[PDB]
Amino acid sequence: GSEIFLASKRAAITYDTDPATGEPRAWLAPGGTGNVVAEQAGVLNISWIASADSEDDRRASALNPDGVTMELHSGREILVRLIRHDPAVFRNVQNFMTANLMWAANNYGWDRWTQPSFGSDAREGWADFGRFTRDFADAILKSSAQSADPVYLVHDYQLVGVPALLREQRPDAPILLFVAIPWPSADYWRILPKEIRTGILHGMLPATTIGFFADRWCRNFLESVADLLPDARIDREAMTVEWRGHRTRLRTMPLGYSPLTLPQLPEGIEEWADGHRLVVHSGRTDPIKNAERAVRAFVLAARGGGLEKTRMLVRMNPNRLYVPANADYVHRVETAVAEANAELGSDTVRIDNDNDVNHTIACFRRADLLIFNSTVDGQNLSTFEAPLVNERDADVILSETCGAAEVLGEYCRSVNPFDLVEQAEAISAALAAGPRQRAEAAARRRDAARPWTLEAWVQAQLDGLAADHAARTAT
Amino acid sequence: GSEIFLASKRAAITYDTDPATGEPRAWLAPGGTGNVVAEQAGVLNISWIASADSEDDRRASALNPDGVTMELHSGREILVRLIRHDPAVFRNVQNFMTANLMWAANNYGWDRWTQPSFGSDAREGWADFGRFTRDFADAILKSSAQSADPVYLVHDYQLVGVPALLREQRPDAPILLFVAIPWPSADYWRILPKEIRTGILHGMLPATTIGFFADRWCRNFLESVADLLPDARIDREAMTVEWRGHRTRLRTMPLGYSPLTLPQLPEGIEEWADGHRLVVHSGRTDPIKNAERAVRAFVLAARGGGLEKTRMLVRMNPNRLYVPANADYVHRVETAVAEANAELGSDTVRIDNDNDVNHTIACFRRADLLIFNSTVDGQNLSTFEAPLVNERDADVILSETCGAAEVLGEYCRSVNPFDLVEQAEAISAALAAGPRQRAEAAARRRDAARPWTLEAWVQAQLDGLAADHAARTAT
Ligand SMILES: Nc1nc2c(ncn2[C@@H]2O[C@H](COP(=O)(O)OP(=O)(O)O)[C@@H](O)[C@H]2O)c(=O)[nH]1
Ligand SMILES: Nc1nc2c(ncn2[C@@H]2O[C@H](COP(=O)(O)OP(=O)(O)O)[C@@H](O)[C@H]2O)c(=O)[nH]1
Helix, strand or coil: CEEEEEECCCCCEEEEECCCCCCEEEEECCCCHHHHHCCCCCEEEEEEEEECCCHHHHHHHHHCCCCEEEECHHHCEEEEEEECCCHHHHHHHHHHCCCCCHHHHHCCCCCCCCCCCECHHHHHHHHHHHHHHHHHHHHHHHHCCCCCCEEEEEECHHHCCHHHHHHHHCCCCCEEEECCCCCCCHHHHCCCCHHHHHHHHHHHCCCCEEEECCHHHHHHHHHHHHHHCCCCEEECCCCEEEECCEEEEEEECCCCECCCCCCCCCCCHHHHHCCCEEEEEEEECCHHHCHHHHHHHHHHHHHCCCCCCEEEEEEEECCCCCCHHHHHHHHHHHHHHHHHHHHHCCCCEEEEECCCHHHHHHHHHHCCEEEECCCCECCCCHHHHHHHHCCCCCEEEEECCECCHHHHHHHCEEECCCEHHHHHHHHHHHHHCCHHHHHHHHHHHHHHHCCCEHHHHHHHHHHHHHHHHHHHHHC | CEEEEEECCCCCEEEEECCCCCCEEEEECCCCHHHHHCCCCCEEEEEEEEECCCHHHHHHHHHCCCCEEEECHHHCEEEEEEECCCHHHHHHHHHHCCCCCHHHHHCCCCCCCCCCCECHHHHHHHHHHHHHHHHHHHHHHHHCCCCCCEEEEEECHHHCCHHHHHHHHCCCCCEEEECCCCCCCHHHHCCCCHHHHHHHHHHHCCCCEEEECCHHHHHHHHHHHHHHCCCCEEECCCCEEEECCEEEEEEECCCCECCCCCCCCCCCHHHHHCCCEEEEEEEECCHHHCHHHHHHHHHHHHHCCCCCCEEEEEEEECCCCCCHHHHHHHHHHHHHHHHHHHHHCCCCEEEEECCCHHHHHHHHHHCCEEEECCCCECCCCHHHHHHHHCCCCCEEEEECCECCHHHHHHHCEEECCCEHHHHHHHHHHHHHCCHHHHHHHHHHHHHHHCCCEHHHHHHHHHHHHHHHHHHHHHC
16 A cells, blocks of 8 residues: 655645534545545555645644644545745745746746746746745655655646655655646747746656646647757657656646536526527636637627527636736626627626636536637646536537647537637537537537546556556666 | 749849939849859759739839849849739738738747637638739749749748649649748647648648758747648658658758848947947847847846946837837837936937948947847848957847857857846846957857858758759659
C-alpha cells in the first residue's frame, strides 16, 4: 500500500456548527480529490497539504500545525494539513495567478501588439511565487518526513514550482504534477519574462510524470521545453523530456465528470423559458468561456429565421470579478445581450449570474441546445456533465479548442470559437434537427462521455505514475 | 538558361516625362527583385507579372496587355506584365491583407478573448481572394504559354494561393513560393475560419519549394499543416511535407539588405540632437514595430539615472494609416511620447513621421543606440542596414522575435519585446558600455550582417528551387 501525499491549492472543508449541540464542525466535502485517492486499492494512507485561505482555515491550521486526521465514509481517514502563508505573499501570488498575468499566459489572452508590457510588478510577482512554492515544499516534505517511500501528487497551477523542490530532498520519490489548464504554443509561452518562462519549466521538469487533460497541451509543453531549454532533449513520439539528468514522462489523462456531484431552475427561468426552445450557455465569469461570441452567433442565427420561439440563457458563475478581464467580459456579455434583445425583441436573451451548482445542473437538464464554445479550455467538465444529465436530447456545440474536444468532439458540433458565421450555422442546424436524429446523437454522446469519471482519472494518475516511476528507476 | 516567370504584388515602375523632350517615360525602379533575378548567371530571360495599382499602371496595362519589354543596365531586359484586376475585388483583397484580417493572422495581433470575430466579411474577403488568385494564375500561365519549361517564382503573401493553380495547369514545373512574413503557431493559425486556414494551405503546398526568412516560421508552418491536414505527413528534420502526392520542401532563406540602398537628417533633427546621445527607433506605422514599448522602456531606463543628456527619436514611415490598427499604433506612440516628455523634460523624445528613406539612413548614421524591438517581424531588414551604415559604434537592441535574430541575435542585445524591464536594462547597459567594447561589438555585428545581401538571397532561391525540383522529379 502506498503512502500518498497530495498537494493542491485547497482542500474543500465545510466549517459549521452542529445543529443539535452547537459545537463547531469541520468535515471534508464529498468528492474532493483526496477523498477519491483515499478509496483506491494500493493506498495505505494519504495526507493532503493545501493552503489556508479563510479565517476558518487559519484557525484550523493554527490549532493543528502538523495536520488533523479527518474521517471519511467506510471508516477511512486522511491527514489534512493547511499552510498559513504570509498574507502579502499569498495575496500577490493569487494576483499573479489571475488574468492580470499567468491566467492570460496559459489561456491565450494577450494580443501582443498592445499587451502585455511586463514591469517591476511581474518581477515582484515571480519572487512572491518563489516564496509561496517554498512554503508548500517545506510543508509537504515535513508531512512526509517519516515515510520511507512517499508518493507525491501535486495539483493546481499554483504549485507548478513544487516538484523541483520535492525532488531536491527526495531524489527517488514518485512525483506526479497535474496541470489542469492549457499549455500554450511555444511562441506564446515565451511572451513571459525570461526568468518566468524558464523558471516555471525548471520547477516542473523534476516531476516523474506531468499530466495534462489533452494531447495538444502535452505537445505545446514539449515545444516550449525544446524552444527554451537548449539542454533539454524532447521526444515527441515518446512524450518524454530528458534534461539535466531528469527524465520526465508527459501523459494525457482526460477527466470528464464526477458521478456524485453531477433540482429547481433559477427564479424566473422556468416560466420565462416556457413554450420556448432554450439555448443554454454556461460558464464562469472568465473571458475564455466566450459567451459574448455565443450571443452574437445566436443573433446571426435568429436573422436566418426558424428561431421565432427560441430564447437563450447565458448562465454565469461569478468568479474573480476583481480582475479587470473578468469584469470586462461580463460587461461585454451584457452589452451583447442588450443588443440581442433590442434587435430580436425583449427577453429573447437573459443572463443569470449566480453561484449555485444545482441551478446550473437544472439549466443543463432543461436545455434544448447546449453551447460550450470556449476560446480555449484546459478540459471543460460541463460539456461532459450537461449531455449526461440532459433529458431533452439537446445537441452540444463544442469549441474545437476545449481539451474535451479530443474526447467528445466527434460526438458534438465542433466549431471554431472565433467564427460567428460557423457558430451561427451550427446553432441553426442544431435547432433544425429532428427528434429521433437528436435522440440517437445524444445516445452516442452520453456513451462517449460516461467512462470519463473522476475515479478513473485518479486511477489513471496512480497507474501512470507507477509505470513512469518504474521506468525512471531502471534508467 | 532558365526561363523565369516572377509573380509579385507590384513591379515598381517610375512614370515621368523626359526633362528635355517631355515625352512620357516608364522605367523600372533599381533594386527590384526582377532586376536582380535578371542578372543571375543561369537566367536566359525573365518575365515579371504583377498587379496594376495606379492609373499609370492601368493605362500601361491597357496599352500593352501582353507586357512591356523594359530595359535594364548592361543591355538586359525584363518583360513586365501588369494585371488589371476588377477594382472592387482588388480593393477588398488589399483590405483582406491588412490588419483588418490576414496581417493580424500572420503577425500575432489578436488576443483571442475579444478579437477576432469572423463575420460574413471574412467569407466575402476569401471569395474575392480566390478571384484575385485566379487573375494572377491566368496571367502567369498566359505569359508562359510558349515556354517549354517555365520556372515560377511567386512572392508576396497576396499570392499564396497561386502555386496550386499553377500546379493544376503545369504539373512538372518548378514553383517557388516565398513568404516574407512570419508564420504563426498552429493554435494561432487555426483562429482563422476553416475555409481560410485550410484553403491557404491547400494553395501553398503544391509549390516545389516554400521559403521563409527564419527557421521558426518553417517550423510553425509545418505544425500548422500537421494540425489541419490529416492526410499530410510532415518531417521536422527533413523540412518536408508529403500531401496528396505533393512533396513540398520548406527552406529558410534569410535576407539582410540591398547594398544599393546603402545624407542630411530631417529638418530640425540635427540641431535638436546636438550635444546629446541619440536613441533611434525606426519603423513603419505598423503595430508590430513596437515603438510604444520602446518609448516606455526608455523612460524606465531614464528613471534609473544616467540618461540626462540622451534623447530619443521615433522615426516612422507612414503606411496604411487607413487601417485602424495602424492609426491606433500611431496614437499610442504619440501618447507615450507626450508622457515621456512630460516626465523627463520638454523635447526629450521626438516622433518624426514621414516617407523619406534617405532621411531614415541619416538617422541610422547619427544614432548612438538603435532599437529594433518588434513584437514580431518576418525578418526586419533595418536591423542589417543600420549597423552597416552606422559609424558611431551604436549598439543594437533586437527583439528575439524578429526573423533577423536568427542571424544577428548573438551580435545584438537580444530582448523579449514584451518586457519593459528587460528592454530598459538593455538601454541602460547599451548607453553605459565604453567606446572600446561598443567598437568591437559593432565590427562583429557588421561582419555578421554583411553577407546577407539581396543578391545572395535571390541566388539562394534559385539554387534551392533547382535542388528541390530535381528531388521532386527523381521521386
Ligand atoms: N460553484 C459553482 N459551480 C458550478 C456552477 N455552475 C456549474 N458549476 C460547475 O463548475 C464546474 C465547471 O467546470 P469546467 O466546465 O471545467 O470550467 P472551469 O470553471 O473552467 O473549471 C462544473 O463541474 C460545473 O458543474 C455554479 O453556479 N457554481
Ligand atoms: N519608403 C521608405 N522606406 C524606408 C523609410 N525608412 C526606412 N525605409 C526602408 O524600409 C525598409 C523597412 O523594411 P523592414 O525593416 O524589413 O520592415 P518592413 O517595413 O516590415 O518590411 C528598410 O529597407 C528601410 O531602409 C521611409 O521613410 N520611406
